[PDB]
């Protein structure tokens, strides 16, 4: 389906960027145009902290005190008082999406500033990062693009610098992540395995989804980015549309 009948049927915004990484095709499609990022910021983070602890590492525990909580902390707000691992916070981060645990990740990783260090050095001078479920037309805070965000992820993780440990670790977090089974999980051909990280914000109907999509026997990923929006602050996402827009996507692949 043309990309433009589907922000027809659904009066909606698309960003797309794909990059299959075998071949180098590159599929754009408002892939300047920038959307809050948010909680897809998850995916980022955990994969910095991948950077500079070998998996033999995570085991190590940090403290967690009352000071630490954030809301929607499903996990660690049972850890108040107690220590907790590496290996748990990502964990939590990726598969609950858990705030305190984001938070606590970022602290570790040397806090928001070396995390804009990080993206510079990739080559991302778009993407801007949230010292986040909010978003505003107004702002380019909380927000990047479609290819800067595609670019980040292919350098960050399909070809970053990470262990195989590591990458197995985090990519099997995604593959089995129960939160994106609307998204581009419910698109693309049951052949497909897809490793996603979803997002949201809760203003103008920002809902995005960002995978590394293994088609039939191909060892290497094509990274999808998808986002969207809408026209009014408090209209509600249709998951449908991600579901509409990686399926016509996959297809040129």
Request: without cysteine; charged residues 30%; glycine residues 4%.
């Amino acid at each position: 389906k043309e990309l433009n009948d589907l922000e027809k049927k659904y009066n909606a915004h698309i960003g797309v960027y794909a990059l299959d990484t075998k071949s180098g095709k590159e599929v754009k499609f408002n892939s300047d145009k920038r959307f809050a990022y948010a909680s897809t910021s998850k995916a980022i983070n955990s994969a910095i902290l991948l950077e500079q602890v070998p998996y033999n590492k995570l085991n190590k525990k940090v403290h967690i005190n009352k000071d630490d909580i954030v809301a929607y902390s499903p996990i660690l707000e049972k850890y108040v008082g107690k220590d907790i691992t590496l290996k748990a916070l990502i964990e939590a981060s990726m598969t609950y999406s858990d705030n305190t645990a984001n938070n606590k990740i970022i602290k570790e990783i040397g806090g928001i500033k070396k995390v804009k260090q990080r993206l510079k050095e990739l080559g991302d001078k778009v993407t801007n990062p949230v010292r986040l479920n909010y978003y505003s037309p107004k702002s380019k805070k909380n927000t990047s693009t479609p290819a800067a965000f595609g670019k980040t992820l292919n350098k960050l993780i399909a070809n970053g610098k990470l262990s195989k440990e590591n990458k197995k670790f985090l990519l099997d977090l995604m593959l089995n992540n129960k939160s994106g089974d609307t998204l581009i999980k419910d698109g693309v051909p049951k052949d497909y395995k897809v490793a996603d990280k979803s997002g949201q914000a809760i203003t103008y109907a920002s809902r995005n989804d960002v995978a590394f999509v293994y088609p039939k026997g191909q060892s290497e990923p094509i990274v999808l980015v998808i986002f969207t929006n809408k026209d009014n602050k408090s209209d509600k996402p249709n998951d449908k549309l991600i579901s509409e827009t990686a399926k016509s996507v996959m297809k040129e692949f």
